[PDB]
Amino acid sequence: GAQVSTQKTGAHENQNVAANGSTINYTTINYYKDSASNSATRQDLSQDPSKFTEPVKDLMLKTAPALN
Amino acid sequence: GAQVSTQKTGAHENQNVAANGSTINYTTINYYKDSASNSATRQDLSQDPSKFTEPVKDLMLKTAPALN
Amino acid sequence: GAQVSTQKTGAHENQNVAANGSTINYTTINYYKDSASNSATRQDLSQDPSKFTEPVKDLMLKTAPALN
Amino acid sequence: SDRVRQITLGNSTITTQEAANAIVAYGEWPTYINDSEANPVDAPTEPDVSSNRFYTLESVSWKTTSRGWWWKLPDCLKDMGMFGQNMYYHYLGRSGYTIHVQCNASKFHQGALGVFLIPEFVMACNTESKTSYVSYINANPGERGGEFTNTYNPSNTDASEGRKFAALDYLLGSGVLAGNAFVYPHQIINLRTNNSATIVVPYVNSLVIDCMAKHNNWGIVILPLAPLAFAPQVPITVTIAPMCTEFNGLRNITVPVH
Amino acid sequence: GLPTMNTPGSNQFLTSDDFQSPCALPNFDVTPPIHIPGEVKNMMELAEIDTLIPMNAVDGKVNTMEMYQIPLNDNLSKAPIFCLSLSPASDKRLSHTMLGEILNYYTHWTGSIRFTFLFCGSMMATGKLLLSYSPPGAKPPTNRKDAMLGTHIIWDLGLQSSCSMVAPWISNTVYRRCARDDFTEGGFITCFYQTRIVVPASTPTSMFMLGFVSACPDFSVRLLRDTPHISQSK
Amino acid sequence: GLPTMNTPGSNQFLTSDDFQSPCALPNFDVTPPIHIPGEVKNMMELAEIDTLIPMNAVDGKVNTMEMYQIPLNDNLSKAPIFCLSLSPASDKRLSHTMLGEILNYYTHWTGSIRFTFLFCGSMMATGKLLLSYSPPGAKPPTNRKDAMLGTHIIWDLGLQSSCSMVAPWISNTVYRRCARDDFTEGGFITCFYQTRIVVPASTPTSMFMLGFVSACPDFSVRLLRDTPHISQSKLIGRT
Amino acid sequence: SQPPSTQSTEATSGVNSQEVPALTAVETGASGQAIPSDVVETRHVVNYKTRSESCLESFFGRAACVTILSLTNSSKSGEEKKHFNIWNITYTDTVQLRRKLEFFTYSRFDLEMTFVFTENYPSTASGEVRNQVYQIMYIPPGAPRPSSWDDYTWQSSSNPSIFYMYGNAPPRMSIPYVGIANAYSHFYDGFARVPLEGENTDAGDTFYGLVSINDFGVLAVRAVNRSNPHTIHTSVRVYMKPKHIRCWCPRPPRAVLYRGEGVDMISSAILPLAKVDSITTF
Amino acid sequence: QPPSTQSTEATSGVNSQEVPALTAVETGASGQAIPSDVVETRHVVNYKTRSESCLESFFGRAACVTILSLTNSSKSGEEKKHFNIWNITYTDTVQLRRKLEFFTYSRFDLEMTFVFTENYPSTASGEVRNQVYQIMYIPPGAPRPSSWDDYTWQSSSNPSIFYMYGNAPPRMSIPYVGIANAYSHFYDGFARVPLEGENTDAGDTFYGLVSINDFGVLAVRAVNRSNPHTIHTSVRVYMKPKHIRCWCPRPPRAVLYRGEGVDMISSAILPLAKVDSITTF
Numbered sequence A, B, C: 001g002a003q004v005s006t007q008k009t010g011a012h013e014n015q016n017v018a019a020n021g022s023t024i025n026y027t028t029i030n031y032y033k034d035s036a037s038n039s040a041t042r043q044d045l046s047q048d049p050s051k052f053t054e055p056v057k058d059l060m061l062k063t064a065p066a067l068n
Numbered sequence D: 001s002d003r004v005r006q007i008t009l010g011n012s013t014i015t016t017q018e019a020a021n022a023i024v025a026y027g028e029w030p031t032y033i034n035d036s037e038a039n040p041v042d043a044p045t046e047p048d049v050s051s052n053r054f055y056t057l058e059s060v061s062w063k064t065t066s067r068g069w070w071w072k073l074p075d076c077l078k079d080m081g082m083f084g085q086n087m088y089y090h091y092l093g094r095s096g097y098t099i100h101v102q103c104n105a106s107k108f109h110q111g112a113l114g115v116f117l118i119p120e121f122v123m124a125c126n127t128e129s130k131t132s133y134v135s136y137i138n139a140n141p142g143e144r145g146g147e148f149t150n151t152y153n154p155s156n157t158d159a160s161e162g163r164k165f166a167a168l169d170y171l172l173g174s175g176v177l178a179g180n181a182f183v184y185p186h187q188i189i190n191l192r193t194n195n196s197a198t199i200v201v202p203y204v205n206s207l208v209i210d211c212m213a214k215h216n217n218w219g220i221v222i223l224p225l226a227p228l229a230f231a232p233q234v235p236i237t238v239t240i241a242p243m244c245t246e247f248n249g250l251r252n253i254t255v256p257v258h
Numbered sequence E: 001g002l003p004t005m006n007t008p009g010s011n012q013f014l015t016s017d018d019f020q021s022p023c024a025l026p027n028f029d030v031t032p033p034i035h036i037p038g039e040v041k042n043m044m045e046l047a048e049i050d051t052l053i054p055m056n057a058v059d060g061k062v063n064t065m066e067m068y069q070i071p072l073n074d075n076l077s078k079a080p081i082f083c084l085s086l087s088p089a090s091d092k093r094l095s096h097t098m099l100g101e102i103l104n105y106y107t108h109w110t111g112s113i114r115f116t117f118l119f120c121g122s123m124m125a126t127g128k129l130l131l132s133y134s135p136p137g138a139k140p141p142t143n144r145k146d147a148m149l150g151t152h153i154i155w156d157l158g159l160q161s162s163c164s165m166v167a168p169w170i171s172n173t174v175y176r177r178c179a180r181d182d183f184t185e186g187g188f189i190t191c192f193y194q195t196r197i198v199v200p201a202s203t204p205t206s207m208f209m210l211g212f213v214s215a216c217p218d219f220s221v222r223l224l225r226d227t228p229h230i231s232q233s234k
Numbered sequence F: 001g002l003p004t005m006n007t008p009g010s011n012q013f014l015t016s017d018d019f020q021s022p023c024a025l026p027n028f029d030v031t032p033p034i035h036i037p038g039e040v041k042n043m044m045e046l047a048e049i050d051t052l053i054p055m056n057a058v059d060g061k062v063n064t065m066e067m068y069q070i071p072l073n074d075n076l077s078k079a080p081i082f083c084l085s086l087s088p089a090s091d092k093r094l095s096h097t098m099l100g101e102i103l104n105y106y107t108h109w110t111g112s113i114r115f116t117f118l119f120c121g122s123m124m125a126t127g128k129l130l131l132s133y134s135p136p137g138a139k140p141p142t143n144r145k146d147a148m149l150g151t152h153i154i155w156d157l158g159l160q161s162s163c164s165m166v167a168p169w170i171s172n173t174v175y176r177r178c179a180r181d182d183f184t185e186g187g188f189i190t191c192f193y194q195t196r197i198v199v200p201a202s203t204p205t206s207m208f209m210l211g212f213v214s215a216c217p218d219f220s221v222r223l224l225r226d227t228p229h230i231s232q233s234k235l236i237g238r239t
Numbered sequence G: 001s002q003p004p005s006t007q008s009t010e011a012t013s014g015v016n017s018q019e020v021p022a023l024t025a026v027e028t029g030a031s032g033q034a035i036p037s038d039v040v041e042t043r044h045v046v047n048y049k050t051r052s053e054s055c056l057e058s059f060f061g062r063a064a065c066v067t068i069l070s071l072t073n074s075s076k077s078g079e080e081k082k083h084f085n086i087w088n089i090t091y092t093d094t095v096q097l098r099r100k101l102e103f104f105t106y107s108r109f110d111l112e113m114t115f116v117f118t119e120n121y122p123s124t125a126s127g128e129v130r131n132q133v134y135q136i137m138y139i140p141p142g143a144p145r146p147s148s149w150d151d152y153t154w155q156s157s158s159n160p161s162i163f164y165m166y167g168n169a170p171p172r173m174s175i176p177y178v179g180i181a182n183a184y185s186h187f188y189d190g191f192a193r194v195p196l197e198g199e200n201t202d203a204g205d206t207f208y209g210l211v212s213i214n215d216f217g218v219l220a221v222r223a224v225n226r227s228n229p230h231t232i233h234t235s236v237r238v239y240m241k242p243k244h245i246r247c248w249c250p251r252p253p254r255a256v257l258y259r260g261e262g263v264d265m266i267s268s269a270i271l272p273l274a275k276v277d278s279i280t281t282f
Numbered sequence H: 001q002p003p004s005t006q007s008t009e010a011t012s013g014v015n016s017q018e019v020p021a022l023t024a025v026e027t028g029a030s031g032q033a034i035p036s037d038v039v040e041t042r043h044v045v046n047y048k049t050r051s052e053s054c055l056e057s058f059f060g061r062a063a064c065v066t067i068l069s070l071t072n073s074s075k076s077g078e079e080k081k082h083f084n085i086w087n088i089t090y091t092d093t094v095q096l097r098r099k100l101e102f103f104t105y106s107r108f109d110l111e112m113t114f115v116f117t118e119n120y121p122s123t124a125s126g127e128v129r130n131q132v133y134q135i136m137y138i139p140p141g142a143p144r145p146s147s148w149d150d151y152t153w154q155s156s157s158n159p160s161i162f163y164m165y166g167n168a169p170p171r172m173s174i175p176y177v178g179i180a181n182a183y184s185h186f187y188d189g190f191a192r193v194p195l196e197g198e199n200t201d202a203g204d205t206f207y208g209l210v211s212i213n214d215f216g217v218l219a220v221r222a223v224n225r226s227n228p229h230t231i232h233t234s235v236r237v238y239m240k241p242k243h244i245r246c247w248c249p250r251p252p253r254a255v256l257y258r259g260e261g262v263d264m265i266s267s268a269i270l271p272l273a274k275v276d277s278i279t280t281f
């Protein structure tokens, strides 16, 4: 019941696409009943900066004057 | 001859209904001749407290007069 | 998610054709998230010495006068 | 246009002709607890209009020597309206807030006020004798609020304010540089452009609901980021309304230490 | 049973390890999550937030509120009025900003940096400022002329009370060290008056500007490291 | 839970080890590759490059630029102009050519070797040179007569300023040792004038030739070893 | 698919239009949004760089030392109490870790704990001492605590524990998130109790802050071996890292060295920045 | 199948206008002649390959790169010897740097293995408990510890290995970490450009790659308190590049190295042996 994922690239690896070669492949099995025992999660690169940098109720555009 | 079962939920799970895909699983293989050598059993939460709190020959309903 | 490939031959092996017996195969699984943790890569034996031994814009044939 | 606004809650209307747009912290509009996240079993009370009113705090004066002002949010409203009363009638409660700050000055005035809403505005104690040694009364200034200083003079024992918070302005009273306060939801009222700013915040806790008499979810910090100057004193008025509030656990009337 | 060989690295503890381990509290019920507001997923989300630059580093303005207040006058001057060394993590003026502090947990960094300024003078006063970035390996921008040769914008003071200057990622290296590496010189950020501030009668003639620093969207960091800004007794 | 048995070889450090290991710096974002000119994939690609032979290693020439200059003259003599033992990673003259330096890291080697000679005399000069190779037996030739009884080429000096001879792979073994070894001795290379260099008036009577050596396409090496060509004082730990 | 990269640069020419991304207002609470393609003429640049080391999981992914406990196994009766050491569960003992954890008001994570042991002969005279095994046990708040190293509570019938032989691989265990809230808070602007009218004239001084609010019990570490003629000083270092972590509501980093477990400041260190000769000095 | 070296084709006598044996070295091209062009050859079949000399194989072994010295001191002095901070480099070792220096540029991942060994250097031998060591990497820009018991050993971000003596030698993989797309073995340049208004004495270590090499330091300490009976521990650091590509090949140094760069010692300017004559085989 192993899961697999793409390994992060290294010195002799392919381009940043990481799509070239089935050989880039880390395989893992969880051995414990509590998921707290599992290794760390997959990188989550999802980002949402607007929450902190642009939490404006009004719709603000960058080209529009900020004021008006 | 492995079995795959789900894990109890950890901090990262946003699915407290155990529905975040293959992500949460563990694999177990029994390696011994006797079952006494197996790890602890699967959790079984089936319960029936009426055995000890309402072991009444006569069925009682909660709004029924206890005695008529 | 194992990789399977051919081993380099030894004393009791075939005609160094690796097309005689399946007993020359071996397997491997990557166990770490970063590819930098893997084993050394499969050897790339492609070579192109001409870039260092005959880097000449206007190509000479070896039997031609080098200078006409 | 963005500069002209009107906001209403309950039976009170706030208008302005010079608004710095408006901020909703984290882009999350305040709401009510969903059944899926309910913690207490007790059916909730939703006072609606009886407590969702804009209330004013005693104004403060902006002087050229002012270092800053601060309030604990659920605490500053404890003194007024049904919001204040409900907090002494129930064990638990939840409240989001709309905070409006106005500073009326002429075109000839300069300077600016940074307005920050800080979750968990825990302040340092003004003593070197004990850790976090701050009394309930001096940690909860209510309607009046507190202010900032520019010097640190921790007291011997409890001789004077030894149970009160330290309040360096440049370190926000907690040991963090004020220049990074901008990480918190904020607006700046520059007297050259705006006379007001409005920030809306969700209830924020590790809990869906908590006891208002024990825990101040948010504080309000106002700083003279650019000094007041004129060719001066300018009053600052802070007007606050709770919103989307809930109460649970009707209990004995609670009367805190005076 | 199954023949095995222990390899180098066996029975050692690495602080960077990412291995599974048995739970000390079996079958523990983790208190269900709720939609807690303000979720942060990445440190760069904080790197992009504009924070103030403690520019007024002159002795007596250091470690006080005035530290972030940059004076301006209507007095005619051709003097520089601003001098940053850019290195977000090593520049004494930047290392304590949120961007600089985040970078003090990293060895290397890339991407463009944005500098935003806000004028807090009278509504009545007007004028123009030159904001400029000069690439490294050059004589510091001694005067306005040199500032004009480099990358620059002119900020015409008016209703739009703020402006942003961007110092693009011009670097020979892909990444620069966060460390004070003379090799990866920051370049120079400066400011000159484009024109004298015009101040009408009966207004202040001395005013302040605030400056902010933040990461641009092409910004990133590499290896994690201990920050030198915190310490303790043994 | 899974029973296991540790084999001999367990918990040892082998410098030749190719086992996987934990990354000290997880999730590191590696600087992307770019194209860089001159990629080398195999060390043999460098072994195939013709480099000079420091043949003139006699007292007074040794360790200076003249070391690479093979003297030639218009005088008539039957004497050889040069001689080399064909032991590419042993001979004092060959062990420091690029081919020798690559081979100094190998224990065993095989395949043909090419020797190229460049005449740097005046355009006005002419003549003929005999290059010859013989297998490691009988006697080194000390006479053109015997040099002929072997593999040889006669080079007409002319507009094509250079020529080459290849010592073919003649060996009883598949691989010869790099180490000096009588058993695996590689043979002899010599050169004699076939025709004396002919010099017209106003042309110098002495000339130099630059000899070069390189690996041929069939060349290979078996086994890595450390080179007895670089050293240092013993290293002592900082304290 | 491909791990998403940071912003690429589109090429652009000169602009004489009335759109002005260069000018803004930060009074609104928003940050400036300008990038090089708004400010200068640009070339196209493909950006494949990835913000992976800045993910919170990566940021908090390395084990930090949290505490050092001192235990002594000794035959002197006056030193018997030193045979074991009870430590409060906390992360406030070491500053480098607190500094990062305190960046967020709230967090949720599972915890990995490991230990490092070392020992010596602190006395003038060394001698033969056998390999010691250490017993590490968690005593949740409300659970009985031992009064002595040989106290019956080391039966550990419920309290989880580890027996480690010195010299074997450093011990390790996983702890699931244990909050009673839906997140751990790193701050608490409040009091454990609300003092009421009457009672104590001005209470709360002894119970303000997180330091009062979240009791996580103690970790008890004992030597398990009886004493020897030659005694041993044994040092145990506790290491920790969050794993499977989420955070909310970011905060400024601390500029002032921490005055212990509160947010308190020492008057001797409230000046975080060095001076520069002038504004115009680089 | 993998490629083999080329086979030689059979040939016979040749009488033609072709000149494979003649060339023009001046063109920069190497000679192209093979045995089949110059002598009569037989058909042979070559099954021999060149994997043994591929770059991954050439650079396929770990080498000792430095020696560190750690001491557990029971004396009032030498407390400082409990830890050792070394600049990370491979230039302390001549065999490894010489191999790497075959190329101008290189790109590789690196793995490190450490070997610990210890003795009892004093005449006063006695009991010492088994010791544990911490190997901490201190990235460039990170603070250095002042002492073995310095708070920076907390390693909250700095990665480290805790090794108990006697267990398998500790080991870790390091990804390529250059800020360039390739590591530079050589650098004909200066870290900073001196400008016109500066002093004409403008050397001062700015010249050479050394001035632009900052890969942090490796800090190793004993993790215990002093024991009455002292220990001298020698730590040998091993390095092996992995997944390696290189560019722009260059000839190796024939003389002993002088320090970090390519500086020469006057005592080693004459690397080759003399012979009796040109005509001696």
Ligand SMILES: CCCCCCCCCCCCCC(=O)O
Residues within 6 Å of the ligand: E024, G089, G090, G091, G111, G137, G138, G160, G161, G173, G175, G178, G184, G185, G216
């Ligand atoms: C057998 C070992 C069990 C030890 C359980 C003690 C609780 C560990 C979590 C301590 C940190 C809680 C506060 C926080 O994460 O912010």
Ligand SMILES: CCCCCCCCCCCCCC(=O)O
Residues within 6 Å of the ligand: F024, H088, H089, H090, H110, H137, H159, H174, H177, H183, H184, H185, H215
């Ligand atoms: C946790 C240990 C991290 C060690 C990081 C440094 C890795 C080696 C850097 C490259 C060595 C220099 C190569 C060169 O001279 O161009």
